[PDB]
Design a protein around this ligand. Structure first.
Ligand SMILES: *[C@@H]1O[C@H](CO)[C@@H](O)[C@H](O)[C@H]1NC(C)=O
Ligand SMILES: *[C@@H]1O[C@H](CO)[C@@H](O)[C@H](O)[C@H]1NC(C)=O
Lengths: 111, 159, 111, 159
C-alpha cells in the first residue's frame, strides 16, 4: 500500500467488484458486462479491482496538507479505462474499454 | 498404463493432476482423470494423483481479500482496514488511535500497529484517529487578531 | 477528467501501452504478458491503458496548492491491479492480476 | 440462395457482412463470404455486402489516439497534449500560454484554447505555461522580514 515518513493528501480504499453488470464504454455507450469469460476449457470469472476515496474531506477543509487559507480542496474519485468482455443489447459480444474507479485525487478551487 | 495398480506420486504409473487441476476419478481400475478447477470457486495448488480441487477460502470477519482465489491459489486474506495482525495472538485488534494532542508517524499496517507522536510545537491534532498526522498551526497575519493561541490539542482560532 | 473552475494538485498523462511483455503479478512473481487473446477466433490484441504523472514537481516545491511552508510534497505515479492473459516461465497460461500505472497522487512529508 | 444474381444491400438475396466483418469473397456466382476484422488492424463499421474490412487509421503528428481502432470502429484521434482543435481552420495550434503575471482559468483541451487572467492582488505567476493558475503570495510572519513585496510576476521573498 504505502510507506513511512510520508502521508497521503487524500485517502483511498480498494475492493473486488464481482457483480458489475453494466458500464459506460469509451465511445460513451452503455454496455452490458458479462459475468464470465469463455476460455478453451474452464470459464474465468470477470470481476474488477476498483479503488475510490474514503471521504471527500480527510481533514477539516478538504485534502490533507493544502493551504486551506487560500484554496478549497476535495478528494475526488477518478476513473480510468479497463478492458471488459461486453455486449450491447445482448448482440455484439467482445472486448471493449470501460470506465471504472481507479484512484482518489485532490482537486483545488480558489477561495 | 496402470492395469489395476497405482504406483503413485512420482512413481510413474498413475498421472498426477497438475496445478490448477484436481482429480475427478482416481486410479481405480483405469488411469486417473483430471478436471480443471473453476476460477474463483475451486483451486488446486498442489501436484497430486489423489487431491480434488479444493474450495476457495473465504476471507471473513475482521478480514478482507487481498488476492482472489484463482485456479492454482487460494485467496489470500489480510486483516481489514483499521486492524492489524497482532503477533502475540491469532487475530487482529483495532488499530490504536493517536489521541487528541497526538498524531500519526507510521500507519497501522499489517502486523504493525499505529505509531503516534505527541505533537511538536507549532503543530496540533484536535482529533483521535489513526490516520492524521499533527497539522501545522494557523499563524495569524498582521491584519487578524486571534483569540486562541495554538495548543497541541487545538488550532489557534482567528478573526 | 475535465475541469471548470478547478485545478489538480498533480498533473497526469495517459497512453496506450502495446508492447508490455512482462509484469509483477499480485503474488509478487514475475510473469510474461501475452501479446494477444485467443477468442471464438479472431484474436484480440492485449494492450493497456496507463496513466502516470506528467512530472514530480508541477510548481516549485512539489504539488500544486500545498502549504510548502510546512510540508514537502511530490507527485507520485501510483499503480493498481488489472487482469492479464499471462504465463509463467512459458508454462501456465491464464489470467492473473498485475500491477500497472493508473494515476498520479500527491504524497506529503513534514519539513 | 442467389444462383448468379446479386440483388443487393437490403435486397434479400446476397448476405451482407455485419459490423466487425468485411467481405472476403463477393457474391460471385456463389454467395458472399464474410470474415472477421482483425482487432486493432482492421475494422468494419458498416453493414455491407461489398465492403472489405478497412485498415485502422493512424493518429499522426499533432494528434493522439483517445480511442483504439477496434473491430467495429476506427480509432478516434484527438489533438495531442499542448494543442487544441482550432475550428477556424482544420488544424491544431499550440495551446497559448498564460504569460508571467497571468495564470490559468480554463484549461486548453478540445476546441478550446487556454483561457488566462491577469493575477489578482495577493497572487502571482512567475512562469509562462498553460497549466498553472495564479498562486497566492507568501505572507511573512513577524519572525522573518521580507525583502521583495509580492508582485503579479513574482512572489514576495522572505527571511
Ligand atoms: C477405462 O478407461 C477407458 C479410457 O478412457 C474408458 O473409456 C473406459 O470407459 C474405462 N472403462 C469402463 C468400462 O468404465
Ligand atoms: C461455390 O460454393 C460452394 C459452397 O460453398 C463451394 O464449396 C464450391 O467449391 C464453390 N465453387 C467452386 C466449384 O469452387
Amino acid at each position: 500500500k504505502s510507506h513511512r515518513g510520508e502521508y497521503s493528501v487524500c485517502d483511498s480504499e480498494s475492493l473486488w467488484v464481482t457483480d458489475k453488470s453494466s458500464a459506460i464504454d469509451i465511445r460513451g455507450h452503455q454496455v452490458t458486462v458479462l459475468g464470465e469469460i469463455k476460455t478453451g476449457n474452464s470459464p474465468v470469472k470477470q470481476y474488477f479491482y476498483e479503488t475510490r476515496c474514503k471521504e471527500a474531506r480527510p481533514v477539516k477543509n478538504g485534502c490533507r496538507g493544502i493551504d486551506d487559507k487560500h484554496w478549497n480542496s476535495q478528494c475526488k474519485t477518478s476513473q480510468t479505462y479497463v478492458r471488459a468482455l461486453t455486449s450491447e443489447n445482448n448482440k455484439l459480444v467482445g472486448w471493449r474499454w470501460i470506465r471504472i474507479d481507479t484512484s482518489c485525487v485532490c482537486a483545488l478551487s480558489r477561495k | 498404463t496402470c492395469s489395476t495398480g497405482l504406483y503413485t506420486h512420482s512413481g510413474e504409473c498413475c498421472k498426477a493432476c497438475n496445478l490448477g487441476e484436481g482429480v475427478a476419478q482416481p486410479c481405480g481400475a483405469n488411469q486417473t482423470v483430471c478436471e480443471p478447477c473453476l476460477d474463483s470457486v475451486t483451486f488446486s495448488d498442489v501436484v497430486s494423483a489423489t487431491e480434488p480441487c479444493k474450495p476457495c477460502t473465504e476471507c471473513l470477519g475482521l478480514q478482507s481479500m487481498s488476492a482472489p482465489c484463482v485456479e492454482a491459489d487460494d485467496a489470500v486474506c489480510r486483516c481489514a482496514y483499521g486492524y492489524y495482525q497482532d503477533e502475540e495472538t491469532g487475530h487482529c485488534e483495532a488499530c490504536s488511535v493517536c489521541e487528541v494532542g497526538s498524531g500519526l508517524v507510521f500507519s497501522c499496517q499489517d502486523k504493525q500497529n499505529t505509531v503516534c507522536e505527541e505533537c511538536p510545537e507549532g503543530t496540533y491534532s484536535d482529533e483521535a484517529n489513526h490516520v492524521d498526522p499533527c497539522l501545522p498551526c494557523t499563524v495569524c497575519e498582521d491584519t487578524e487578531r486571534q483569540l486562541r493561541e495554538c495548543t497541541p490539542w487545538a488550532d489557534a482560532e482567528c478573526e
